[PDB]
Structure 1
Amino acid sequence: GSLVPRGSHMYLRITNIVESSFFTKFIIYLIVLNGITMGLETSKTFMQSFGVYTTLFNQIVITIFTIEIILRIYVHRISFFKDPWSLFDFFVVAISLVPTSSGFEILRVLGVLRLFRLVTAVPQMRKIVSALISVIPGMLSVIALMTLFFYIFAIMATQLFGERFPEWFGTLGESFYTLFQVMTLESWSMGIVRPLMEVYPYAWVFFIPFIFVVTFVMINLVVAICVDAM
């Protein structure tokens, strides 16, 4: 493979650096250091004392991480952009590269996602994430079914309850949101359906069978993962 390596005179030179155990260790060390520093940046008292420290520390770590991804791309070439873990690394570092201002501060908040590089860089963490994720394919049909089910009941509820209950059902999205809440069973009766039954006494004919189905499916979804994994 590798098609046309960078040398392989300096290709191998940087490859042994990148491929080393020290290289991974140092990076992980910085992940943990930056994770600690990010919790510290949460205190307004710490930021009034050591604000400058952590801010420069931050931009320093991010420079190292960018160089790291660059070195890893020269070594792994095309293989890099075919590796989900490396892709996550790339995108979570790229996010972190957007200037101190501009756009919105969501990009600054999403910067904290780089701490998930602990999962990337540490094996066994990969292994558990990998195990959890591979369970998802045998769920897509049920998820698909459930999504269609929510969509149909959201449309119904929007048009049955939206005019007299705009906050909870005024809009398709509002209805989706509220139906999700009912599925988690959070205040479904005292907070949503009892108030609904004061105008619409048969509202129970809608939410109870909704609750049976959504619950029945969730149970089968779990049993699936119990059986499909066992």
Structure 2
Amino acid sequence: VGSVAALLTVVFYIAAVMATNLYGATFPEWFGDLSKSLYTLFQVMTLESWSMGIVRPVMNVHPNAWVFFIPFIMLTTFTVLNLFIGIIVDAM
């Protein structure tokens, strides 16, 4: 369970470093610094306005922004599910 939690933190930090670089100048409210980025990627991970509120306005400037977010959503959402199920199993 600890190895799963460690993998997500490393992925979350690398993704937020990547996102800061990619979309920080064009969209500074969302990815202007590692802080703003980690908060946006948590919001994207929970799914709240991931497309209409974040990806669609982003994709309008960066046409292939979906190559980052969709695989990010596929990985993090799977891992978070796997982590939460893992805690439940390592309790009974």
Bucket of the pairwise TM-score, normalised by the shorter protein: over 0.9
**Aligned mate of 2:51, from 167, 189, 200:** 189
| Residue 175 (str. 1) matches residue 37 (str. 2) | yes
Matched, 1:164 2:26: yes
Letter matched to residue 65 of structure 2: A
Corresponding position of 2:88: 226
Distance in structure 2 (CA, Å) of the matches to 1:224 and 1:153: 23
Q: CA deviation at 1:214?
A: 0.5
Cα displacement (A) at 1:226: 2.7
TM-score (norm 2): 0.93
What is the alpha-carbon root mean square deviation over aligned residues? 1.1
1:42-57 to 2 correspondence within 5 Å?
none
Whether 1:198 aligns to 2:79 is no
CA–CA distance in structure 2, aligned partners of residues 168 and 154 of structure 1: 11
Partner of 1:81: none
What residue number does 1:150 align with?
12
Secondary structure of 2:90 counterpart: helix
- Match of 1:200, SS state, is coil
Q: Which has the larger radius of gyration?
A: 1
Equivalent pairs counted in the alignment come to: 92
Q: Which amino acid in structure 2 is aligned with residue 174 of structure 1?
A: K
Q: Which has the higher contact order (CA 8 A, sep 6+)?
A: 2
Amino acid in the other structure paired with 2:40 = T
- Separation (CA, whole Å) in 2 of partners of 1:205 and 1:174: 20
For 1:229, what is the secondary structure of its paired residue?
A: coil
How far apart are residue 225 of structure 1 and its match? 2.1
**3-state SS in 2 of match to 1:213:** helix
> Which structure 1 segments of 5+ residues have no match?
1-138
Provide the rounded CA distance (Å) in 2 between the counterparts of 1:151 and 1:226: 26
> Please, which runs of 5 or more residues in structure 2 have no aligned partner?
none
> 1:24-173, aligned counterparts within 5 Å?
139-173=1-35
Measure the CA separation in 1 of the matches of 2:36 and 2:87: 31
Shift of 1:218: 1.3
